[PDB]
Swiss-Prot record:
Protein name: Phosphatidylinositol 3,4,5-trisphosphate 5-phosphatase 1
PTM comment text: Tyrosine phosphorylated by the members of the SRC family after exposure to a diverse array of extracellular stimuli such as cytokines, growth factors, antibodies, chemokines, integrin ligands and hypertonic and oxidative stress. Phosphorylated upon IgG receptor FCGR2B-binding.
Superkingdom, natural source: Eukaryota
Record family assignment: Belongs to the inositol 1,4,5-trisphosphate 5-phosphatase family.
UniProt domain comment: The SH2 domain interacts with tyrosine phosphorylated forms of proteins such as SHC1 or PTPN11/SHP-2. It competes with that of GRB2 for binding to phosphorylated SHC1 to inhibit the Ras pathway. It is also required for tyrosine phosphorylation. The NPXY sequence motif found in many tyrosine-phosphorylated proteins is required for the specific binding of the PID domain.
Gene: INPP5D
Length: 460
């Protein structure tokens, strides 16, 4: 039975509002409701992997696993296997997979980050899971960020703490945070970004929602505007939103938004908002297509509606050659020409590079670059033709063209990374000098760029 080249992944996020779910939640897993919904002809086709994030979840892990497995069994007639479950306070992530995938999944990791300081520490944060699926690394983050329309900067700070401190994926990738450790990273949750309009426009906003006219609301969505200004979620994607705001509803109906300030809200308004989101980041030139992104209409126990998203995601095999793993393949090489890093740092130390990739036996350190000043004040670190020739473990182009090289630029003085990026080996040609480029980030913020040329030799 052949190994898959693509799988489908279900992501769900639901703030349950500390209430038990209703008896039937299958519309969630079927991507039915509002927005970009799944075709009815697919209803009996199971996704390969289901990743379920909850916030304000009142259930035990056992209780929620019961409900999830029974719901998927009812839909698909398949008994899913539990890959992982992890809970921080009332924030939870469950990963379920088809039983045929049990021996394709390995290296399962879980972690959590608590976001608060002093008073703020004690209910917000994130949980995550990572694993390998054959040759492909997958990461998943469910976060419950700070509440309140006035707190978008605190949400952005929560995001950066989660990014920095969530310990998932391959610990040998020591310069890299979760935003570079995975072929595909999915980050979802009750992110709590709000529609930033005046509170006296509440009834106008509800009218727009009833007309399914979201454009003038989305133009004020804090997550879209902060992402456009590069304040958060740099280099992530989100599908277009075509479903009504998922917060804040009166419970047991979806006919009414409960926006008014009350003692229970700390005298805050909750104007209708897209609190509940799914974003992703995949390595360059890997197949990833969003197939659905929407909200259910028939699950009403919470003041939030569940959100679903589904993806078709490219995956690769666990390649074995006569040579690697366990040795290099002399017929393969990776070479770099006319390369240089442009850094935003105001510092003047020497820099070197590290190249990290699963196609190498271990990471490779370059010689120091030569610092120059750019025309507009920048630090330019020139490597020219000085970068090492990388020796992949497998030369077969059906393996090597699917790989990626992670790059860190490190201070010689401190051995700290000043920037991380990723180069695809999915080239237009082999044995040909071709341009390469990545932005460089550190703690998820832009710190520079790396560009130059690559020349890849494969056994063809
Ligand atoms: Mg709540």
């Amino acid at each position: 039975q052949p190994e898959p080249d693509m799988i489908t992944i279900f992501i769900g996020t639901w703030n349950m509002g500390n209430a038990p779910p209703p008896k039937k939640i299958t519309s969630w897993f079927l991507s039915k409701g509002q927005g970009k919904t799944r075709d009815d002809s697919a209803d009996y086709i199971p996704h390969d992997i289901y990743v379920i994030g909850t916030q304000e979840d009142p259930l035990s892990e056992k209780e929620w696993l019961e409900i999830l497995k029974h719901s998927l069994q009812e839909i698909t007639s398949v008994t899913f296997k539990t890959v992982a479950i992890h809970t921080l306070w009332n924030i939870r992530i469950v990963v379920l997979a088809k039983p045929e995938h049990e021996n394709r999944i390995s290296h399962i990791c879980t972690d959590n980050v608590k976001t608060g300081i002093a008073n703020t520490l004690g209910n917000k944060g994130a949980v995550g899971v990572s694993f390998m699926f054959n040759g492909t690394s997958l990461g998943f983050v469910n976060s419950h960020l700070t509440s309140g329309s006035e707190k978008k900067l605190r949400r952005n700070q929560n995001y950066m703490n989660i990014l920095r401190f969530l310990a998932l994926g391959d610990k040998k990738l020591s310069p890299f945070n979760i935003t570079h450790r995975f072929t595909h990273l999915f980050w979802f949750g009750d992110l709590n970004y709000r529609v930033d309009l005046p509170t006296w426009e509440a009834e106008t906003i509800i009218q727009k929602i009833k007309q399914q006219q979201y454009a003038d609301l989305l133009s004020h969505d804090q997550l879209l505007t902060e992402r456009r200004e590069q304040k958060v979620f740099l280099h992530f994607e989100e599908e277009e939103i075509t479903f009504a705001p998922t917060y804040r509803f009166e419970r047991l109906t979806r006919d009414k938004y409960a926006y008014t300030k009350q003692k229970a809200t700390g005298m805050k308004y909750n104007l209708p908002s897209w609190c509940d989101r799914v974003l992703w980041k995949s390595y360059p030139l890997v197949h990833v297509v969003c197939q659905s992104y929407g909200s259910t209409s028939d699950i009403m126990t919470s003041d939030h509606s569940p959100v679903f998203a589904t993806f078709e995601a490219g995956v690769t095999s666990q390649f074995v050659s006569k040579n690697g793993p366990g040795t290099v393949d002399s017929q393969g090489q990776i070479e770099f020409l006319r390369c240089y890093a442009t850094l935003k740092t105001k510092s003047q130390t020497k820099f070197y590079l590290e190249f990290h990739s699963s196609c190498l036996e271990s990471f490779v350190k370059s010689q120091e670059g030569e610092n120059e000043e750019g025309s507009e004040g920048e630090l330019v670190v020139k490597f020219g033709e000085t970068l090492p020739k990388l020796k992949p473990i497998i030369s077969d182009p059906e393996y090597l063209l699917d790989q990626h090289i992670l790059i860190s630029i490190k201070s010689s003085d401190s051995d700290e990374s000043y920037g991380e990026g990723c180069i695809a080996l999915r080239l237009e040609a082999t044995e040909t000098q071709l341009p390469i480029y990545t932005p460089l980030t550190h703690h998820g913020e832009l710190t520079g760029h790396f560009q130059g040329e690559i020349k890849l030799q494969t056994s063809q």
